[PDB]
Design a protein around this ligand. Structure first.
Ligand SMILES: [Mg+2]
Ligand SMILES: [Mg+2]
Ligand SMILES: [Mg+2]
Ligand SMILES: [Mg+2]
Ligand SMILES: [Mg+2]
Ligand SMILES: [Mg+2]
Ligand SMILES: [Mg+2]
Ligand SMILES: [Mg+2]
Ligand SMILES: [Mg+2]
Ligand SMILES: [Mg+2]
Ligand SMILES: [Mg+2]
Ligand SMILES: [Mg+2]
Ligand SMILES: [Mg+2]
Ligand SMILES: [Mg+2]
Ligand SMILES: [Mg+2]
Ligand SMILES: [Mg+2]
Ligand SMILES: [Mg+2]
Ligand SMILES: [Mg+2]
Ligand SMILES: [Mg+2]
Ligand SMILES: [Mg+2]
Ligand SMILES: [Mg+2]
Ligand SMILES: [Mg+2]
Ligand SMILES: [Mg+2]
Ligand SMILES: [Zn+2]
Lengths: 144, 81, 72, 141, 55, 129, 140, 102
RNA sequence: UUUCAAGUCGAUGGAAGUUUGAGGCAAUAACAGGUCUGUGAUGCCCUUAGACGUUCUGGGCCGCACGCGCGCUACACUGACGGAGCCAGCGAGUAUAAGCCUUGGCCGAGAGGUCUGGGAAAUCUUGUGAAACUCCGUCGUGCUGGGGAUAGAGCAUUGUAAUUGUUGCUCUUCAACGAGGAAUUCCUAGUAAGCGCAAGUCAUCAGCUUGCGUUGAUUACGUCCCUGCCCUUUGUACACACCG
């Protein structure tokens, strides 16, 4: 509840899930740099890890940093609701998942060929780079 | 059946609008001017103003008798109503 | 992009704050940011304590604006 | 002369009733309070994670004090706000039903309110007794 | 056989489910106060019904 | 972050859809199958199956029974392109109307749970220039 | 009963029914003290009818108002009008008219809206535009 | 089944005949020593319909604004049921409709 | 002030002193203006059984290298979120239906589900406890917690039927945009601008109109410089009238 000082404990650059995180960002919003981790998700893993949000990223110790990456990789194990997850009712094994930095684009990709392999209409328009959700293209989306 | 106040006064007006055009098409040749619907207990008085009240009330009032019957059978009214 | 304002308070800046803020006609969140090069969040906690420590007198209290002056 | 709830500012009265309700500790807090957002129109959960449920229950108690048989559906509309539809204009959206229903149910088991006849939730015989008490311990400073 | 196909598609809760009192049209219908009249048919019958222009 | 490794494992993997592999999937009744697919499919079967979807399945079943040298089960034609693909009809070939022609599709396992008309585009793609 | 006069003040839609009774000087807004007006920056609008004449005028009378309708700001102007009109109306009925004309002089010399309701109302919207006078942007 | 608290509800589009029937009933409830409550002016309802002027869709966007005012009045009488009904036939008017509820 | 006339500008009183504010109606003629895609309004022409009638199924009217118009979000700190305070007006609402407005209670993070009750309505929904707004906090000039397209996975509602996602909700992705050239629109007081709400379309869907109210200004109260129209004079070989 007052200004405090520290020396040599701050860490300017963090590396989490093979992604570089700026250490002077508040912890809740620093994790949003990790692709697959939004503001809503970062708020809960910090609250499940008992890491108070009033700390900057460099303020955290190694003990806390490992405790966060453990929760993100095992959300259901930390009373994180299934509906709160990124990839729930997975296509192949039917279990609730939350894909992260490098895994997200792989299974996002795997979904694209899975749409294109069966040659569905939604997959076809995805291939063309057009809007797939029924949007009109007559007059919008003309950039490149 | 149970009809709201807003929807009842409009229905009376809509009934008047449709009834008025019916006389214009049927009694066009007799100089039809207008119709007045005088509601009363146990009866629905309708006063039609025409130049010729013989064409409507012709051959022992056969047409007017056969013309009120066309309204009882279309608005589900009692024959005496 | 050129801001790069300091958000962690070390010891060299801490006593520099307590040595410079008293010699100010008017201190505020922007005044602390403008001249002490500290961040806005760090300025707000500094003001709320400096008032509790008696160095700073609260002219006006508001969430969006904190008007403070020297206590000497 | 006496003191009532209406004789104290609303904003700092709730901050005082929230503090008492947390320190008393008898209010039962549902297990999802650290996860959920207050309204579907909101985009983030409350910033005061430890105390937001107590403060909202304190707000609910004060709001019910001043009225007669307010329901739980009306409470969702009261705390609801403008939703941030992306490109469409803003709109008012009601708050979450469970949070409000749990609070009034939680407030019902702490003794301050009860189900009123002809709908709603009245304030209890003891509900007036203890709110007016908190008002007195609010304005002495 | 044919009777189960002729005019078999549902014609309720739709725009084709209702029509003007006067012209039996499907477009521009007015359902307020149970008028069930086309907007064009309404103008030529508004005075008879009891609707007047005041302001 | 500690570390990370991705050594993917197998065991003669059979194609699987949401935890159910092809072997059990195909002889599951469609009543049981709909309980493990999306919300839209689950709602549709609770709303009541009219005679049209059930009639196509009966014909599709017979078309496979027509041939027992294990080749393609001959095409059944239909207009009903709001049909949801079920494991019972995997491998069958259907002619799905696109408004003008009978687009021919063979029901692959990855097509299950999709709408039958979603694989027959109703419009020829635009080609400027 | 006792010496009781009842009046009202109005703004755009807000209407504040003032019950100026007599007594020890009780002045409440919807059962709440004026010392708790929600708009703090506008707290001096309802303080004006008090400090203009002096709080000694309110020793013998108590005022309870019920303000409904309008908006947040429109309600403040309705309340201050009901108070000013209530004080004048009580003097005209239970005090000499010389004092009533004195109070009315200070109020009118400061702000007409203390006693006279503002007659401004919202102009109706006309078709061909999104507002009363505003029109849809034209293109050639 | 004798003297009752009886409500007569009056609705019409035009106020002149409505007030004549209302006053005539009040007049007959005066010389007859019958205690009465009313008439009560209910807030008038403005039934508004706003259509486009153009039968087609060409021209300036001009709109009609039609109106249908409905005025409703209720009068409470303390009299036996035979007396109140015959009062209605005395003050019968084509425009105004009458409903009687106990 | 004035021809001391019509009037105009200031004060005072007044609720109101701009036609008190705002509208509805609105002359003599006219346009090849727009509609036969409103009419069981119509003349004529075409078709009338392999129909150009009507009905059923499916698709399309949404289709996308592009030019243009009415708009909505925004580009941040006069701000975003998070709690808290908490105020309108115009209106609408059903029955043996083919289902209306729906409180209150109970489940559900939500979206939503379920059980009762009120209301054919100044009675109940409803004080429609609306949003901007205000207070206290977090953020701290950063493509950042501005902005929320595009897209992946999932949960509900309506509907026979949602695939070319009707719509809503949850997590994730988080794009151009850092105030906009030549040009050009609307507007003078409760007005402009924000800000929402209702009614219409409507089984579902409002970034649309018609209204309503909340907060509420800057700047003229003048001119013919641009633009359009009217009048007078003038020219005319035009009168089907310069599309001569
Ligand atoms: Mg609100
Ligand atoms: Mg709120
Ligand atoms: Mg915004
Ligand atoms: Mg927005
Ligand atoms: Mg076809
Ligand atoms: Mg006028
Ligand atoms: Mg032409
Ligand atoms: Mg035709
Ligand atoms: Mg035709
Ligand atoms: Mg039509
Ligand atoms: Mg044919
Ligand atoms: Mg179109
Ligand atoms: Mg398309
Ligand atoms: Mg326009
Ligand atoms: Mg806010
Ligand atoms: Mg009401
Ligand atoms: Mg960003
Ligand atoms: Mg988005
Ligand atoms: Mg200009
Ligand atoms: Mg111009
Ligand atoms: Mg649609
Ligand atoms: Mg709508
Ligand atoms: Mg000449
Ligand atoms: Zn019609």
């Amino acid at each position: 509840p007052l200004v405090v000082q520290e020396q040599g404990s701050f860490q300017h650059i963090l590396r989490l899930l093979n992604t570089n995180i700026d250490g002077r960002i508040k912890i809740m919003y620093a994790l949003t740099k990790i692709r697959g981790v939004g503001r809503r998700y970062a708020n809960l893993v910090c609250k499940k890890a008992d890491v108070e949000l009033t700390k900057r990223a460099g303020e955290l110790t190694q003990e806390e940093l490992e405790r966060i990456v453990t929760i993100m990789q095992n959300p259901t194990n930390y009373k994180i609701p299934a509906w709160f997850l990124n990839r729930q009712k997975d296509q192949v094994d039917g279990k609730d998942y939350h894909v992260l930095a490098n895994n997200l684009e792989s299974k996002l990709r795997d979904d694209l060929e899975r749409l294109k392999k069966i040659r569905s209409h939604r997959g076809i328009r995805h291939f063309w780079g057009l809007k797939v959700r029924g949007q009109h293209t007559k007059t919008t989306s003309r950039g490149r | 059946a149970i009809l709201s106040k807003k929807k009842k006064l409009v229905a009376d007006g809509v009934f008047y609008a449709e009834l008025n055009e019916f006389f214009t098409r049927e009694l066009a040749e007799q100089g039809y001017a207008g119709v007045e619907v005088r509601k009363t207990p146990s009866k629905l008085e309708v006063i039609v103003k025409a130049s010729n009240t013989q064409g409507v009330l012709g051959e022992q009032g056969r047409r007017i008798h056969e013309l009120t019957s066309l309204i009882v059978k279309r608005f589900k009214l009692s024959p005496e109503g | 992009d050129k801001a790069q304002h300091i958000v962690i308070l070390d010891q060299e800046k801490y006593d520099r704050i307590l040595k410079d803020v008293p010699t100010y006609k008017y201190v505020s969140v922007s005044v602390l940011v403008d001249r002490l090069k500290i961040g806005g969040s760090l300025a707000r906690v500094a003001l709320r304590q400096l008032e509790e420590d008696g160095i700073i007198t609260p002219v006006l209290k508001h969430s969006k604006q904190a008007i403070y002056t020297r206590a000497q | 002369p006496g003191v009532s709830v209406r004789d104290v500012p609303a904003q700092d009265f709730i901050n005082a009733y929230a503090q008492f309700l947390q320190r008393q500790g008898k209010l039962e807090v549902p297990g999802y309070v650290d996860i959920v957002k207050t309204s579907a129109g909101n985009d983030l959960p409350p910033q005061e994670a430890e105390t937001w449920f107590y403060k909202r229950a304190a707000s609910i108690a004060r709001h019910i004090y001043l009225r007669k048989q307010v329901g739980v559906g009306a409470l969702n509309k009261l705390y609801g706000g403008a939703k941030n539809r992306g490109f469409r204009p803003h709109k008012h959206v009601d708050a979450s039903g469970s949070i409000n229903r749990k609070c009034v149910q939680a407030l019902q088991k702490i003794g301050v309110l009860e189900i009123s006849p002809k709908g709603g939730r009245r304030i209890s015989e003891n509900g007036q007794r203890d709110l007016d008490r908190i008002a007195a311990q609010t304005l002495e400073e | 056989a044919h009777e189960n196909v002729w005019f078999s598609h549902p014609r309720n809760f739709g725009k084709g489910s209702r029509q003007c009192r006067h012209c039996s049209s499907h477009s521009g219908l007015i359902r307020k106060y149970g008028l069930d009249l086309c907007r064009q048919c309404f103008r030529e019958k508004a005075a008879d019904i009891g609707f007047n222009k005041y302001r | 972050m500690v570390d990370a490794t991705a050594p993917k494992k197998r065991t003669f993997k059979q194609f699987s859809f949401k935890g159910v592999d092809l072997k059990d999937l195909v002889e599951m009744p469609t009543e049981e199958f709909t309980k493990l697919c999306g919300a839209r499919v689950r709602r549709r079967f609770s709303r009541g199956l009219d005679s049209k979807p059930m009639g196509l399945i009966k014909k599709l079943r017979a078309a496979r029974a027509a041939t027992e040298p294990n080749e393609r089960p001959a095409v059944v034609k239909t207009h009903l392109r709001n049909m949801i693909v079920v494991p019972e009809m995997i491998g069958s070939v259907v002619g799905v109307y696109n408004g003008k022609v009978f687009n021919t599709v063979e029901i692959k396992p990855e097509m299950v749970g999709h709408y039958l008309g979603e694989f027959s585009i109703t419009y020829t793609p635009v080609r400027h220039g | 009963s006792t010496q009781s006069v009842q009046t009202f003040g109005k703004k755009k839609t807000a209407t504040a029914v003032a019950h100026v009774k007599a007594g020890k000087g009780l002045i409440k807004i919807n059962g709440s003290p004026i010392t708790l007006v929600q708009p703090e920056i506008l707290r001096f609008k309802v303080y004006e009818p008090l400090t203009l004449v002096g709080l000694d005028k309110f020793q013998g009378i108590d005022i309870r108002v019920k303000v409904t309708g309008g908006g947040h700001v429109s309600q403040v102007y309705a309340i201050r009008q009901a108070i000013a009109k209530g004080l004048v109306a009580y003097h005209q009925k239970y005090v000499d008219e010389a004092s009533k004309n004195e109070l009315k002089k200070i109020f009118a010399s400061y702000d007409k809206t203390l006693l006279v309701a503002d007659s401004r109302r919202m102009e109706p919207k006309k078709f061909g535009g999104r507002g009363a006078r505003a029109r849809f942007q034209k293109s050639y | 089944q004798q003297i009752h608290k009886i409500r007569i509800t009056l609705t019409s589009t035009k106020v002149k005949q409505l007030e004549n029937v209302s006053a005539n009933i009040i007049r007959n409830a005066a010389q007859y020593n019958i205690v009465k409550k009313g008439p009560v002016r209910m807030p008038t309802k403005v039934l508004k319909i706003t259509t486009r002027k153009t039968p087609n869709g060409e021209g300036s966007k001009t709109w009609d604004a039609y109106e249908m005012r409905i005025h409703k009045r209720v009068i409470d009488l303390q009299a036996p049921a035979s007396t109140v009904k015959r009062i209605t036939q005395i003050t019968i008017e084509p425009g105004v409709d009458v409903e009687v509820t106990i």
